[model samples]
Target: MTGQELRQLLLDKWGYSYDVQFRRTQGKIFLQVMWKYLEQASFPMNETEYQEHLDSVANYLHALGGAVQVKTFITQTKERPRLGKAVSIPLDLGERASEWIILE
Candidate 1:
């Protein structure tokens, strides 16, 4: 899908009645995704533990749903001044390729 179409798909599926907008800044696109919480609950789990659980869930869902993960990382040779492209995500964000779907 095109970037704009992907943006709309995300908004429609996970908008949560909140404002989910996308914009271009300095030749780079940015998405403002808002996620609402139903209630805060304590999970007797550490970051690694919780991340593992979430990764599994996401992987299964994505594989079953035939979802694809879009690459968000800027390559090393693609240099663009004033562009907000950087590797800012945590290293452990997606441990499995099957679960590496990100709509942001």
Candidate 2:
């Protein structure tokens, strides 16, 4: 399983349908997602929760032979941007925020 595959797997099993825009330029993969929820209920409300969630997700990805960096920003009253960087992997982000796709 590659980095992109692992990301899709996690999103499919644990995330709601959302849309992600993917771009590959200069051998770098860039992903920007807009979720229907806009706002996640599980975002870190405190330091402990933030660290814990980060650690959990990070560990999970690391175990799968990938490294991940995730950042969540509240874009509006109910919209947020989840940004991150990882090595190349298969991906699918269609209409839905979670329209999972893989790159071969």
Candidate 3:
């Protein structure tokens, strides 16, 4: 495979298709991945439920060697252009994912 199809894994097993968008701010450097979701008014669940799901998803990712966080190394030494500018270091979980991908 070309790369880890995290999107596919999430969709197929988790029943949600949350997408990721990465950006390095123009004015200053802020490396982050926005976990885009359905807007509140359109989302099927309540706010707390959304949080619960996010927590679960994040923990699952950690179990697979993904380090999702609020600040990357550059962001830590910071000007704080935005608050809660979290980041998730992209992982090369080719080994674990390969085990599961192979099972399928």
Candidate 4:
């Protein structure tokens, strides 16, 4: 179908049935939605839970190939209090936050 036909069909059935808006421009247009923060129940993920998540995504990783490896990398460190001195270590943010989305 031509662009005009596509636009007309969308005009009749798109935003009327959805929460999104649509428009046509001479060139390209981009709608950037910048959210300041997302509020929800947040917690850290224990090692067992983290591993379970990895296990669940095993098929996804395989499908995505080797270049898409998702692993942990230390960014910062600080010493833990001892008798007098301390030891530096990678900071662990416990209870992992999870949002699962599946596309068909």
The model with the greatest lDDT is: 3
Window of ten residues with lowest summed lDDT in model 4: 31-40
> Total clashing residue pairs per candidate?
0, 11, 0, 7
lDDT by residue (28-77, candidate 1, tens digit) is 43333334211225435454554454445335334443123222322222
RMSD of 2: 14.0
Q: Which ranges in model 3 have alpha carbons more than 4 Å from their true place? A: 1-39, 68-91, 95-104
Assess every candidate by TM-score: 0.25, 0.27, 0.34, 0.21
Can you rank all candidates by TM-score, best first? 3, 2, 1, 4
Q: Which lDDT tens digits does candidate 4 get at residues 4-68?
A: 32223223432211111122244322111111111212424443453344344334323333112
Please identify which of the two predictions, 1 or 2, would achieve the higher TM-score against the true structure: 2
Candidate 2 lowest-lDDT run of ten = 68-77
* lDDT of all predictions: 0.34, 0.37, 0.41, 0.25
- How far residue 50's Cα lies from its native spot in candidate 1, in Å, is 0.4
Stretches of candidate 1 off by over 4 Å are 1-41, 66-104
Question: What does the lDDT read for residue 98 in candidate 3?
Answer: 64
Winner of 1 and 4 under TM-score: 1
User: What is the alpha-carbon lDDT for the whole of candidate 1?
Assistant: 0.34
Shift in Å, residue 82, candidate 2? 7.1
For residue 57, give model 1's deviation from the true position in Å: 0.3
List candidate 4 segments past 4 Å from native.
1-43, 66-104
